[PDB]
Design a binder for this molecule. Structure first.
Ligand code: CLA
Ligand code: CLA
Ligand code: CLA
Ligand code: CLA
Ligand SMILES: CCCCCCCCCCCCCCCC(=O)OC[C@H](CO[C@@H]1O[C@H](CS(=O)(=O)O)[C@@H](O)[C@H](O)[C@H]1O)OC(=O)CCCCCCCCCCCCCCC
Ligand SMILES: CC(=O)O[C@H]1CC(C)(C)C(=C=C/C(C)=C/C=C/C(C)=C/C=C/C=C(C)/C=C/C=C(\C)C(=O)C[C@@]23O[C@]2(C)C[C@@H](O)CC3(C)C)[C@](C)(O)C1
Ligand SMILES: CC(=O)O[C@H]1CC(C)(C)C(=C=C/C(C)=C/C=C/C(C)=C/C=C/C=C(C)/C=C/C=C(\C)C(=O)C[C@@]23O[C@]2(C)C[C@@H](O)CC3(C)C)[C@](C)(O)C1
Ligand SMILES: CC(=O)O[C@H]1CC(C)(C)C(=C=C\C(C)=C/C=C/C(C)=C/C=C/C=C(C)/C=C/C=C(/C)C(=O)C[C@@]23O[C@]2(C)C[C@@H](O)CC3(C)C)[C@](C)(O)C1
Ligand code: KC1
Ligand code: KC1
Ligand code: KC1
Ligand SMILES: CC1=C(C#C/C(C)=C/C=C/C(C)=C/C=C/C=C(C)/C=C/C=C(C)/C=C/[C@@]23O[C@]2(C)C[C@@H](O)CC3(C)C)C(C)(C)C[C@H](O)C1
Lengths: 52, 155, 227, 176, 179
């Protein structure tokens, strides 16, 4: 069924599971560099060169 | 300074030595100017009152939903305020009572409550001779409205 | 001549929660969780421990330990009452006898579940809430002026009850105090909304959210009839 | 002071367990408990006379429950026949009175109001009414306990029992 | 007065939390108003307790208008039920007290009303402070009660006898307001 109005084409909950697991996997890698990053460190430029 | 003796171009008769006879509080000039200005300001918004009601700007809607009184039901003559419910007329002069004591207190005999002239929410301050000139116009149009009401309420 | 609180609005330091409003001088910065939020000026008129008698009715100057005492267990009760407003609707209810009556513990509207469960259920909850408040007063009669607000002698430091070890570092402990206070202030707002929605809807919150996070029965597609 | 009041003529200072000589540190709280238990029982005894005389207000204490004031029993079961949301309103207000208005951690029992508002000027006219509060309070403790066990033993409330004439415990059907 | 600490009672102390007392002369003006408003609002709260309990006089308030005491509303509209010839009598007597007998110009609030042995202030000054604080405190609580009684009728349309018969004590789930 393709003309039915499903959120992101999710008609089975398998597809919802792989959307979460796919997006959380790169998030967890990305949190390996940008987790443990200080929230109160600001800057007054157009661009920040903070850390890695 | 709106309490000077130089506004209304002069002059009239009595000076009323009966006022200082045994009621000496009412013999003060500053209060008689505060009364004449206040009787003028009330009279001026009363002629526009008998211009708006008499042109049948009635209102959109009901005045009292439970008494079933719409705004087109109250008369246009001088029996307008004595035809609304007294539960409604009580709210009118209750709000005047907060005006008469708290917001624009009539014990302030100057009459200047810091409002300017033509601009609400930010006062239009008049500075020089035109400030001097608009004060007597307030009295002089206040006097024409005082005599205009008793010409429009005997008949 | 002047008020003792009119001079606290005369100094009137810069605020953080209301950064346009100039918080009064009685918020010194030295208290946990002070973000300069006192627009009505209650910290300028500090309260004392009135429950100890008439000699404790006065409040000392510049001491908000009893405002913080009332803040902490308004929020500690509120936190455990988010879950009380939610968990019967989520994790089911309890069964009843013929004595208590069947469906006594089963009212999923949490407000009339007060008026449905037996009185001995509420009386024993109230007496257990009473017992730890007897424990509170006995702590404030011993400690007196060296009484820390929110202390029921549960945890890390001196001769308190610690069945879990809980031996935090001395400044990870002040982060736990700030995590408690920020959850205290948040769940006070949260349990107000739960109490107000349970009146306004008539049902529990899982029963109002779950009905709004579901598709309507006239809108539900018939669905998946393709062989 | 307070240690000689509560001691009137027929018994003197009456302490058969001897806790005045043994534990004098606990006396002024124990006086405060005695005065509070007295004042609670005095309103409790007076309440049982008013209930059993069928002095009720009117109408419904709980119109949702369809429960009138006269539908309340006049015995032990009366405060427990009041609905759970109504009983919580009593205890919340009585906790407001016993912690804020008349804080019961104040152990001399003195809360700004005097005897009918007045301070007793004379120090032994004060001590006479301080003893009269304690003695009527101690007599009402036995009065409310003697009214509670004698309802649950005879099975009837105080109107029921007095209507029936069930006053003699020796010629009815009871134990002994 | 500030030095005795008349308004400052033991829960809150000197409760001037917004800083309105910036000297001693504006306290005497404000206390003259607070005590006057408290005396008016206390009789206003005893009115609504008596009116909403249905306790009325027997007979006609106005026999020439045929208006019984029983057919005056017990709510916020019951004063204006009364004919204006009749409550001009109320304004004229109360205005005569405000200018002659208990002149409200007196900022002290004393008008000599002493009910002797129930206030012997010269031999018990603690009873003076008890009755002076309780005139303010009962006046402050009745000032907020009459603001309660007024607005509960406005937002619900029912008076206090009618909204208590319906059990309408929650602004949630009803058809009134956006709540
Ligand atoms: C509706 C809201 C409103 C607003 C925004 C204003 C704003 C103003 N009026 Mg005002 N005016 C108002 C209502 C208002 N009026 C009403 C209800 C009346 C009575 C009919 C007037 C009668 C009035 C007079 C006679 C004058 C102003 C004038 C002014 C101007 C004052 C500053 C200036 O001199 O330039 C300002 C733009 C002054 C003005 O416009 O001079 C150029 C001026 O002379 N007004
Ligand atoms: C529970 C309420 C209560 C409390 C706290 C007290 C406390 C006191 N009484 Mg009072 N008294 C009471 C009720 C109470 N009394 C009653 C009901 C009567 C008989 C009507 C009396 C008759 C009485 C007299 C004549 C005198 C006192 C005195 C005293 C003081 C003696 C000091 C002491 O340690 O005594 C010992 C400790 C106690 C009395 C506390 C009671 C502790 C035990 C465990 C209670 C057990 C009672 C028992 C279970 C009751 C069963 C029967 C009941 C169910 C009907 C002390 C303040 C004396 C005084 O005033 O000193 C100047 C004194 O002369 N008492
Ligand atoms: C506060 C004061 C007070 C007062 C005025 C009363 C009054 C009464 N009680 Mg109550 N009662 C009280 C407190 C009080 N009580 C207390 C503190 C308790 C224990 C908590 C009780 C427990 C109780 C019970 C269980 C009963 C009463 C009963 C009564 C009624 C007495 C009838 C009778 O013959 O008693 C008998 C007389 C006495 C008990 C006093 C004598 C004491 C000696 C030791 C008894 C010896 C008896 C023995 C066989 C020797 C007899 C010899 C003799 C024939 C010459 C009477 C209305 C009876 C009733 O049905 O009415 C409600 C009843 O059954 N009372
Ligand atoms: C008639 C009105 C009125 C007036 C003139 C006063 C005046 C005073 N009060 Mg009192 N008070 C009142 C009503 C009033 N009070 C009420 C109803 C309560 C119960 C909430 C209290 C509770 C109270 C306590 C516990 C104490 C005082 C104290 C004082 C004194 C300190 C200065 C002050 O805070 O002024 C107040 C400021 C003004 C009157 C000017 C501001 C006017 C506002 C902006 C009007 C807007 C009000 C709004 C429409 C409705 C408010 C209610 C709303 C929150 C629901 C001063 C004499 C203290 C005292 O006596 O110490 C010795 C003190 O300890 N007041
Ligand atoms: C120095 C001199 C001092 C003199 C002092 C003398 C004072 C006299 C006492 C005055 C008491 C106060 C009266 C209040 C008015 C009132 O009661 O309304 C009477 C009616 C009663 O209606 C009613 O409604 C009822 C409908 S129902 O039955 O309940 O459904 C109905 O039964 C009833 O018939 C009908 O009347 O109530 C309402 O209309 C609600 C009004 C809401 C509030 C009005 C605000 C007033 C304006 C002031 C706003 C601030 C002003 C500042 C800004 C400029
Ligand atoms: C602000 C505040 O809070 O108050 C203020 C204001 C106020 C109120 C004006 C003031 C006062 C004065 C007060 C309160 C005066 C009240 C005193 C009070 C209430 C005194 C009860 C005595 C009862 C006794 C002795 C019982 C005997 C025992 C009896 C009667 C029995 O045998 C019970 C009975 O069932 C049995 C067991 C056996 C039967 O045979 C008989 C019956 C059936 C009856 C204050 C206190 O100064 C301050
Ligand atoms: C089941 C039901 O339905 O309920 C029933 C239950 C029940 C119990 C059966 C009922 C009953 C009957 C009852 C209880 C009857 C009790 C009646 C009662 C209580 C009768 C008091 C007399 C005292 C007198 C005459 C005093 C003379 C006093 C004199 C002459 C003095 O000089 C006194 C004195 O002090 C002074 C004045 C002056 C001083 O210088 C001298 C002294 C000190 C000496 C009811 C009514 O049927 C209802
Ligand atoms: C004869 C007959 O038929 O009668 C009928 C008809 C009739 C006449 C229509 C009726 C009526 C109504 C009547 C008679 C009277 C109502 C009277 C009145 C006078 C009602 C206002 C009080 C002031 C208020 C509420 C607020 C002050 C509020 C404030 C905020 C302040 O004062 C501000 C201020 O303090 C500060 C905060 C800061 C400083 O900068 C100083 C100032 C001072 C500025 C009746 C009697 O009902 C029935
Ligand atoms: C604070 C907010 C506020 C509310 C919520 C409110 C409510 C009612 N007003 Mg009021 N009112 C003001 C404020 C408020 N009024 C103000 C600032 C003024 C200008 C001074 C004012 C003037 C009048 C007049 C002349 C009348 C009047 C009425 C009603 C009545 C509808 C009756 C009905 O639904 O049948 C309801 C309850 C009529 C009336 O009372 O008739 C018995 C009537 O004639 N109002
Ligand atoms: C703050 C103002 C206030 C309101 C607006 C209010 C309202 C209701 N009271 Mg409450 N009340 C007090 C204050 C207030 N009550 C106070 C100061 C006390 C003395 C401690 C008190 C005592 C009791 C008792 C014993 C009962 C009781 C009840 C109800 C119920 C009736 C409608 C119904 O129940 O259908 C309505 C909602 C009964 C009840 O809760 O029944 C489940 C009941 O048994 N009340
Ligand atoms: C000095 C002696 C005295 C006389 C002889 C007298 C006479 C009448 N009064 Mg009374 N009066 C007072 C004193 C006197 N009144 C006092 C001290 C107060 C408290 C301030 C007061 C209050 C009210 C109110 C609220 C009403 C009222 C009325 C009438 C009316 C009845 C017949 C009628 O219906 O005309 C007749 C003329 C009603 C009314 O005027 O209705 C239009 C009405 O509603 N009065
Ligand atoms: C100088 C002196 C003279 C003097 C003088 C003179 C003229 C003095 C002045 C007297 C002046 C003071 C007279 C104004 C009254 C107007 C006031 C403001 C009231 C208005 C009334 C308003 C409220 C009107 C309201 C209505 O219309 C409205 C809005 C709607 C209608 O539904 C009903 C009502 C009624 C509610 C002598 C002594 C005579 C002799 C000699 O020559 C010298």
């Amino acid at each position: 069924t393709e003309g039915t109005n499903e959120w992101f084409g999710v008609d089975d909950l398998r597809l919802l599971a792989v959307l979460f697991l796919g997006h959380w996997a790169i998030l967890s890698l990305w949190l390996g560099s940008y987790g443990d990053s200080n929230e109160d460190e600001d800057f007054f430029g157009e661009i920040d060169y903070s850390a890695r | 300074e709106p309490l000077g003796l130089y506004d209304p171009l002069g002059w009239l008769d009595p000076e009323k030595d009966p006022a200082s006879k045994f009621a000496t509080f009412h013999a003060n000039f500053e209060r008689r100017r505060a009364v004449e200005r206040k009787h003028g300001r009330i009279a001026m918004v009363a002629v526009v009152g008998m211009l708006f009601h008499n042109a049948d700007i009635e209102f959109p809607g009901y005045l009292s939903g439970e008494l079933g009184i719409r705004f087109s039901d109250v008369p246009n003559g001088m029996n307008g305020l004595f035809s609304i419910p007294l539960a409604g007329l009580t709210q009118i002069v209750f709000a005047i009572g907060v005006m008469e004591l708290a917001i624009w207190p009539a014990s302030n005999y100057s009459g200047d409550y810091g409002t300017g002239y033509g601009r609400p929410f930010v006062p239009n301050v008049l500075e020089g001779d035109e400030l001097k000139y608009k004060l007597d116009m307030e009295i002089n149009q206040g006097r024409a409205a005082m005599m205009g009401i008793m010409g429009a309420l005997v008949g | 001549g002047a008020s003792p609180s009119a001079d606290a609005w005369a100094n009137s330091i810069e605020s953080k929660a209301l950064p346009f409003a100039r918080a009064p001088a009685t918020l010194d910065g030295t208290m946990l969780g002070d973000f300069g939020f006192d627009p009505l000026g209650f910290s300028t008129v500090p309260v004392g421990p009135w429950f100890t008698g008439i000699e404790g009715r006065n409040g000392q100057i510049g001491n908000l330990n009893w405002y913080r005492e009332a803040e902490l267990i308004h929020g500690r009760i509120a936190q455990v009452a988010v879950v009380g407003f939610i968990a019967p609707g989520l994790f089911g209810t309890l069964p009843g006898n013929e004595w208590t009556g069947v469906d006594a513990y089963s009212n999923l509207n949490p407000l009339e579940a007060f008026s449905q469960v037996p009185g001995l259920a509420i009386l024993q909850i109230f007496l257990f809430m009473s017992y730890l408040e007897v424990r509170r007063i006995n702590i404030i009669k011993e400690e007196g002026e060296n009484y820390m607000p929110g202390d029921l002698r549960i945890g890390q430091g001196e001769g308190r009850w610690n069945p879990f070890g809980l031996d935090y570092s001395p400044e990870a402990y002040e982060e736990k105090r700030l995590q408690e206070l920020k959850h205290c202030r948040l769940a006070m707002i949260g349990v107000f909304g739960l109490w107000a929605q349970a009146q306004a809807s008539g049902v529990g919150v899982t029963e109002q959210i779950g009905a709004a996070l579901t598709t309507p029965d006239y809108y539900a597609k018939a669905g998946y009839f393709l062989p | 002071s307070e240690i000689e009041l509560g001691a009137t003529e027929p018994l003197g200072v009456f302490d058969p367990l001897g806790w005045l000589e043994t534990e004098p540190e606990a006396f002024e709280r124990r006086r405060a408990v005695e005065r509070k238990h007295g004042r609670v029982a005095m309103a409790a005894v007076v309440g049982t006379i008013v209930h059993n005389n069928h002095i009720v207000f009117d109408g419904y204490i709980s119109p949702s429950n369809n429960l009138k004031f006269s539908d309340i029993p006049t015995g032990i079961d009366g405060i427990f026949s009041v609905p759970t949301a109504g009983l919580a309103q009593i205890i919340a207000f009585l906790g407001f009175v016993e912690l804020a208005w008349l804080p019961a951690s104040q152990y001399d029992g003195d809360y700004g109001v005097g005897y009918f508002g007045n301070d007793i000027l004379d120090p032994e006219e004060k001590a006479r009414k301080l003893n009269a509060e304690l003695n009527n309070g101690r007599a009402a403790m036995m009065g409310i306990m003697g009214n509670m066990v004698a309802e649950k033993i005879t099975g009837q409330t105080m109107y029921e029992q007095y209507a029936a004439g069930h006053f003699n415990p020796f010629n009815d059907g009871e134990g002994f | 007065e500030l030095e005795d600490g008349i308004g400052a009672v033991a829960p809150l102390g000197y409760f001037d939390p917004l800083g309105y007392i910036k000297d001693e002369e504006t306290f005497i003006r404000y206390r003259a108003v607070e005590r006057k408003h408290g005396r008016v609002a206390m009789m206003a709260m005893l009115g609504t307790f008596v009116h909403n309990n249905g306790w009325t006089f027997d007979g006609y308030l106005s026999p020439s208008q045929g208006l019984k005491f029983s057919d005056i509303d017990s709510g916020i509209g019951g004063l204006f039920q009364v004919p204006p010839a009749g409550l001009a009598q109320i304004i004229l007597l109360c205005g005569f007290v405000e200018l002659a007998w208990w002149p409200a110009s007196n900022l002290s609030g004393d008008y000599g009303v002493r009910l002797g042995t129930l206030n012997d202030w010269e031999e018990q000054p603690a009873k003076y402070y008890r009755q002076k604080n309780a005139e303010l405190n009962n006046g402050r609580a009745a000032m907020m009660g009459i603001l309660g009684t007024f607005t509960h009728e406005v937002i619900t349309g029912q008076n206090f006898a009618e909204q208590a018969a319906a059990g309408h004590f929650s602004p949630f789930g009803d058809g009134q307001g956006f709540f």
